């Protein structure tokens, strides 16, 4: 077998930001880590991106899925964050906390 150091990857959490909040939270309460996807229309030099990002949970004796998206764009980047955001404040109610 083999192993290694796992990396701190600081950088990479910063530059993430929200994304890696919702990362965190989902993983802390056994949440299906949160997937993201982009929807970009218009103009080359105007183009208006849509972050979505999805979480999924379970319950005891349910199932249910968030979606999330950034609403408020500027750029493609901001707009996902923008959608982990969202999701981060609907997990909180969904979870009761």
Known sequence: GA???EPTTEEE?????AKSQLYNLCS???WKAPL????AEGPCHMKIF???VTVEMK???RITVLEC???PQYKKKIAAEQAAEAA???LKNVGLE
Do not use: A, C, P
């Open 3 to 5: 192993m290694t150091t």
């Open 88 to 90: 981060l404040w609907y």
């Open 50 to 52: 849509t972050g979505k």
């Open 28 to 30: 802390v309460r056994h």
């Open 13 to 17: 959490t910063q530059r993430s930001s």
């Open 69 to 71: 998206f950034g609403n």
């Open 36 to 39: 993201y996807e982009y929807i």
């Open 59 to 61: 319950e005891d004796s």
